[PDB]
Write a protein that binds this ligand. Structure first.
Ligand SMILES: *Cc1cc2c(nc3c(=O)[nH]c(=O)nc-3n2C[C@H](O)[C@H](O)[C@H](O)COP(=O)(O)OP(=O)(O)OC[C@H]2O[C@@H](n3cnc4c(N)ncnc43)[C@H](O)[C@@H]2O)c(*)c1C
Ligand SMILES: *Cc1cc2c(nc3c(=O)[nH]c(=O)nc-3n2C[C@H](O)[C@H](O)[C@H](O)COP(=O)(O)OP(=O)(O)OC[C@H]2O[C@@H](n3cnc4c(N)ncnc43)[C@H](O)[C@@H]2O)c(*)c1C
Ligand SMILES: CC1=C[C@H](O)[C@H]2O[C@]1(C)O[C@H]([C@H](C)/C=C(C)/C=C/C(O)=C1\C(=O)CNC1=O)[C@H]2C
Ligand SMILES: CC1=C[C@H](O)[C@H]2O[C@]1(C)O[C@H]([C@H](C)/C=C(C)/C=C/C(O)=C1\C(=O)CNC1=O)[C@H]2C
Ligand SMILES: [Cl-]
Ligand SMILES: [Cl-]
Ligand SMILES: [Cl-]
Ligand SMILES: [Cl-]
Ligand SMILES: [Cl-]
Ligand SMILES: [Mg+2]
Ligand SMILES: [Mg+2]
Lengths: 497, 493
C-alpha cells in the first residue's frame, strides 16, 4: 500500500521530515518505487493542479517539503539502493539512500568512499544536489566533484513527466541539467531517482576499487574542551583569532593540512564549556605530532588550559562516532543560519559573538556558533565548473539555536536572527559574497536571506547562495521545469517576463 | 576477490572488530559472504583445514565471541542486509546482516507494521533475534522470537559437508527442534543464520503488529546533590513496587515502557525515560499516574519533560535508542528481576554509586521495564525460558583509557557480586531473580571466582531449556564448529 493518506497509521511519521517545526498536510504520500511510478504520480498531480514535493532523507532545515500548500509528496524510501553499476562504470546511489548506508556499502564492499556529510541519517536526494561536503572534503572535495551522471524525472511544458539521464560529458545534450545537479539544490528541477558517481580523473582503470577515493585507513580523533567559567573576552578572542589565522594559513588546495578537519563550537556560556573536535589522517608516522601542532596553535596564549582526549580509530568506525556524526537527536525544534568564510572573524565580530553567547538577555542555553573546517581540495575546482560557486573559502560557519517549547518559537528565532544580523551588520545583515564572507550554502537554507526585514544588502538571496552560477541555473530551470512545478521559498526561479 | 579481506587490506582494521572496541580479532580472512553457497564454501573449507570460524552480523556482541584471537575465519553478513515481505512464504524476511533501524524503517514505512525488538538501531538481526531480542514494545507485543515463523541456517554435518536447511514453527516439521533453538538459543551456537522469517503465530499489514501511531515520551531527572540514602531507597522501592503490581500479561500498563538509570552520583543526576502509547484520550493522565508513583514521598522534585511524537520518529530519539556512541570501552552485566531489589541490595547500590574509593562518572544500573505480554507465553514454548519477570537489570561501566580495564571490570564485578551475594554472586533463577539474558553475555557467570552459587552458567541463561538446546546441538553441530565462551555444548562424553 504505497499511497499514504490521512488516517493511515503511517501518516504522522511520513507527513514530517526530521525537522519537527514543520508539519506537512499532503493529501497523499506516495512511496514511489521506480522512475515510471514517479512519472505516474507527477503527471497526475500536475494535470490535477496539485502542488508536489519530494522527500528523500527529510533533513531539510526549512519548510520546502512540509509547506502547507504541498498536496502530494513523493517519498523516496523504497529507492535506497547503493552499489556499482557495471553497465555505466560508476557507483549508483538511489536518492533515498542514507549517507550511513552509502558509507558502509562503499567502504565495507569496495574500500572506497565519497566526501559527503557528517550525519548518517541524511539522504542522498537533497544532499548531493545541494553541494554535499563533510569531514573528508578538504582531502577530496565536495561529493558533487564525483557526480558523473544523474537520472531525473522532469515535467514538460505540456505537464507530462518524463525520465532523462544527464551526464558530465560536454557533448551530452542534457549536460547543462547535469551541471545544475552539482549544487543547484533540491526541489528545483525535477525528481532525482539516482546519482552515478566516480572520479573524473581520465587515467584511471575501470575497477570499482579504483573509481572513488580511499579514505584514510585510520584517523586520530581529538576532543578539546575549555571551561567557560574562567574565560574572559580577551581569552575568547585570542582563541577565535588563533583558530582563524591557522585556517587562513592552512587551507589551500596544496596544503599538507588538507588531511585535517575540525569543528570549533562557540557555545553559550550557560553550557559550561567551549569545545572542538578534530579529525586527522593517522596514516603518516608523524600524525600525532601534527595534531598536537594544530591544538597548540588554537590554544596558544589563551590562558585557559583545555582538557584534551585523543583516540585512534579505524575509519568506518570513526564516521559513526557522535563527536563527528553529531548526536542523532532530531526531536525538539531548531533554527539554523550559515555563511561561508573567506577570512576569519574580525575583532568587532568576535566582540559581538562574546556578548551574544554570554548575555543573560535570552536564555537560549543550546545556542552555538560552529566553525567547520573547509576549503583544501574543494578549492582546486574552478568556481564555474559546478553549481558550487564558493571555491575559495576556509570555513563554513553555522549558527544554531534549539528549544523544546512549541509555543516559544519567536524568542528563539529572534535571538539567532539578531546574532547573525549583528555579525553581518556591515554588509546588510547577510554574508555578502566576495569579501570576508562568500555568501551562503544551499543545504543550510534560511528563508530570512530573502526577507527585506533581515537582508538590507541589496543583494538578492539567489546571489548569496549561487553567486554568478545563478543565471545558468535559471536557464536550466526555463528549459527543464518550464511550468515551475518544483518550487519553494529560495527555489531557482526564471526572470520575471 | 574483493569479498575476502586479509591483513593489509584498507578495510581490515574496521572489519576485524565489532562495535565493541575492547576486542580486536586476528582473523586470516573476513569473508563478506553474499549467499548461502558462499557461506557453505567458507565453512566446508574451514572445517577441512581445522580453522576456527565465527559469524559477525551487527557486531554488537558484549563479549569476545567473534573477535576471540583464536578465530581464524570470519563470515561478515554485511551484504545480506535485506528486509521485505516474502510473497512465496507469506512472511517477512529479515536477512541476518540487516540492522534494527533498517528493519523498523522498512517494516513501518512500507507496511505499517513492526517487531518488538531492541532499542538500538545499529544492532544486527543476526545475533539479536537468535538471543531472544526484546525492547520498548515487548510489554505490549512479546519478544521478537514470538514472531519467528522460520529460519534458514547453514549447518555442518558429521561428514564435514556444509548444507542449508529451513526450520519452521510447524510441529510436524522434521527440523522443528532447530527452529525452536533459534527462539532464544543465542548466536554462534548452531550454524549460520542467512535469514529469519517473521509473522504473527495467529495480507502483509495484518501479519505483524502495528505499533502505536504516536507515543508520549518523558524524561525525568532527579539531582543527586542532597539525595540521601532514604530518598534514593524510596524512589527505587516506589518504582519496584509499581512494576511488581503492573507487569501481568493482562495489565492495562502493557502499553508503558521505561528505563530508570541509577547513575554514579558524580554524574550529577538520576534519570528515567518513559514511553507510553499516546492513542487513548487519557494517556497524559496515565503517564502522570506512573510518574507520581515513582516520585511519591522521595522529597526531591524531579525536572520532567514530556513530548508526543509519531512512532517511527520516536524510535530514533536517543532517549529510547541510546546515544549511538560505541567508542571507548564498556563492560556489561545483567539479570532478570522477578521482584524488585530488597534492602541490602538498595543499600549496596547506594554505597557503590556514591563511593569515591573509585572514580568514573560512567557506571549505571539501568532498570528496564519488562514482562507484560512476554509473560503470556509458556516458559517452554521458546528458548527464552524467563517468562515471569518484571524487569531486566543492566549493570554497566564505560571508560576511555585502554590501559585501565582492570579497575573498571573490578568495580562492576564487585557491585554485581555484592548485589547477588546472597545467591553466590549471581542471579540464580526461580527466586527474586530469574537468571540472565544471553544477548547481554558475561563470561564471569562461568568463572568460579565470581560464581559461587553451585549453578552453572548454562542454567543461569537457559534454565530448563538447556537439555533440549544440548540435544539440538548434538543433532545439528555434532563437530562443534560453532562455539565460544558460553556456547551451548553437549554433555562430556
Ligand atoms: C539533518 C542534518 C543535515 C545535515 C547534516 N550534516 C551535514 C554535513 O555534514 N554536510 C552537509 O553538507 N550537510 C549536512 N546536513 C544538511 C543536508 O545536506 C541537507 O539537509 C540536505 O538537503 C538534506 O537532504 P535530504 O535528507 O534528502 O532532505 P529532504 O528534506 O528529503 O530534502 C531536502 C530538499 O531537497 C529536495 N529533495 C529531496 N529528494 C530529492 C530528489 N530525489 N530529487 C530532487 N529534490 C530532492 C527536497 O524536496 C527538499 O527541497 C546533519 C544532520 C543531522
Ligand atoms: C550494542 C547494543 C546492543 C543492544 C542494544 N539494545 C538492545 C535491546 O534494546 N534489546 C536487546 O534485546 N538487546 C540489545 N542489545 C544487545 C543485542 O541484542 C546483542 O548484542 C546481539 O547479540 C547483537 O547482535 P549482532 O549485532 O548481530 O552482534 P554480533 O556481534 O555480530 O553477533 C553476536 C553473537 O551472535 C552470533 N551471530 C551473529 N550473526 C549470526 C548468524 N547470522 N548466525 C548465527 N550466529 C550469529 C555472533 O557470532 C556472536 O556470537 C543496543 C546497543 C547499542
Ligand atoms: C558537523 C555537522 C554538519 C551538518 O551540516 C549538521 O550536522 C553537524 C553534526 O552539525 C551541524 C551544526 C553545528 C549542528 C546543528 C545544526 C545542530 C542541530 C541540533 O542540535 C538539532 C536539530 O537540528 C533538530 N533538533 C536538534 O537538537 C549541522 C548543520
Ligand atoms: C535500553 C537499552 C537496551 C539495550 O540492551 C542496550 O542499549 C540500551 C539503549 O541501553 C542498555 C544499557 C542501559 C546501556 C549500555 C550497555 C551503555 C553502553 C555504553 O554507554 C557504551 C558501549 O556499549 C560502548 N561504549 C559506550 O559508551 C544496553 C544494554
Ligand atoms: Cl527506476
Ligand atoms: Cl517553502
Ligand atoms: Cl569467546
Ligand atoms: Cl506460524
Ligand atoms: Cl534513562
Ligand atoms: Mg540537538
Ligand atoms: Mg556510552
Amino acid at each position: 500500500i504505497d499511497s499514504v493518506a490521512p488516517g493511515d497509521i503511517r501518516y504522522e511519521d511520513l507527513r514530517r521530515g526530521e525537522n519537527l517545526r514543520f508539519v506537512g498536510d499532503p493529501e497523499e504520500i506516495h512511496l514511489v518505487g521506480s522512475a515510471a511510478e514517479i512519472e505516474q504520480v507527477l503527471s497526475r498531480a500536475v494535470r490535477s493542479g496539485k502542488r508536489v514535493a519530494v522527500r528523500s532523507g527529510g533533513h531539510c532545515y526549512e519548510d520546502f517539503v512540509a509547506n502547507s500548500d504541498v498536496r502530494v509528496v513523493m517519498d523516496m524510501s523504497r529507492l535506497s539502493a547503493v552499489g556499482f553499476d557495471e553497465e555505466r562504470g560508476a557507483f549508483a546511489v538511489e536518492a533515498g539512500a542514507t549517507l550511513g548506508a552509502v558509507y558502509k556499502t562503499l567502504f565495507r564492499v569496495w574500500g572506497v568512499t565519497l566526501p559527503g556529510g557528517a550525519c548518517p541519517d541524511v539522504g542522498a536526494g537533497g544532499h548531493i544536489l545541494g553541494g554535499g561536503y563533510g569531514p573528508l572534503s578538504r582531502m577530496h572535495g565536495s561529493i558533487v566533484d564525483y557526480l558523473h551522471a544523474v537520472e531525473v524525472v522532469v515535467v514538460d511544458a505540456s505537464g507530462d513527466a518524463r525520465t532523462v539521464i544527464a551526464t558530465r560529458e560536454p557533448s551530452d545534450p542534457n549536460h547543462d541539467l547535469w551541471w545544475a545537479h552539482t549544487g543547484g539544490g533540491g526541489g528545483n528541477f525535477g525528481v532525482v531517482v539516482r546519482y552515478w558517481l566516480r572520479t573524473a580523473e581520465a587515467d584511471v582503470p575501470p575497477e570499482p576499487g579504483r573509481l572513488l577515493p580511499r579514505p584514510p585507513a585510520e584517523v586520530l580523533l581529538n576532543t578539546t574542551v575549555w571551561p567557560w567559567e574562567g574565560l574572559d573576552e580577551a581569552a575568547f578572542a585570542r582563541l577565535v583569532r588563533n583558530h582563524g589565522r591557522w585556517f587562513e594559513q592552512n587551507s589551500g588546495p596544496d596544503s599538507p593540512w588538507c588531511d585535517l578537519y575540525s569543528v570549533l563550537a562557540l557555545t553559550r556560556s550557560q553550557s559550561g564549556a567551549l569545545a572542538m573536535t578534530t579529525q586527522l589522517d593517522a596514516t603518516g608516522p608523524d600524525a600525532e605530532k601534527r595534531l598536537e601542532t594544530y591544538l597548540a596553535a588554537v590554544s596558544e596564549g589563551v590562558g585557559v588550559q583545555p582538557h584534551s582526549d585523543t583516540r585512534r580509530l579505524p575509519w568506518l568506525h570513526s564516521t559513526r562516532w557522535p563527536g563527528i556524526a553529531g548526536d542523532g537527536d532530531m526531536t525538539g525544534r531548531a533554527k539554523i543560519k550559515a555563511a561561508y568564510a573567506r577570512r576569519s572573524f574580525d575583532d568587532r565580530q568576535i566582540g559581538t559573538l562574546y556578548t551574544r553567547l554570554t548575555s543573560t538577555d535570552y536564555d537560549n542555553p543550546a545556542g552555538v556558533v560552529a566553525l567547520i573546517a573547509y576549503g583544501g581540495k574543494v578549492n582546486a575546482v574552478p568556481a564555474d565548473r559546478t553549481a558550487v560557486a564558493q571555491r575559495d573559502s576556509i570555513l563554513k560557519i553555522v549558527y544554531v539555536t534549539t528549544w523544546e517549547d512549541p509555543a516559544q518559537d519567536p524568542v528563539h528565532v529572534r535571538w539567532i536572527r539578531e546574532l547573525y544580523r549583528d555579525v553581518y551588520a556591515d554588509t546588510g545583515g547577510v554574508p555578502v559574497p566576495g569579501g570576508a564572507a562568500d555568501g551562503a550554502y544551499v543545504n543550510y537554507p534560511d528563508v530570512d536571506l530573502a526577507d527585506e526585514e533581515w537582508n538590507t544588502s541589496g543583494v538578492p538571496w539567489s546571489e548569496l547562495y549561487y553567486k554568478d552560477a545563478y543565471p545558468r541555473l535559471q536557464a536550466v530551470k526555463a528549459r527543464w521545469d518550464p511550468r515551475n512545478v518544483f518550487r519553494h521559498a529560495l527555489s531557482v526561479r526564471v526572470p520575471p517576463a
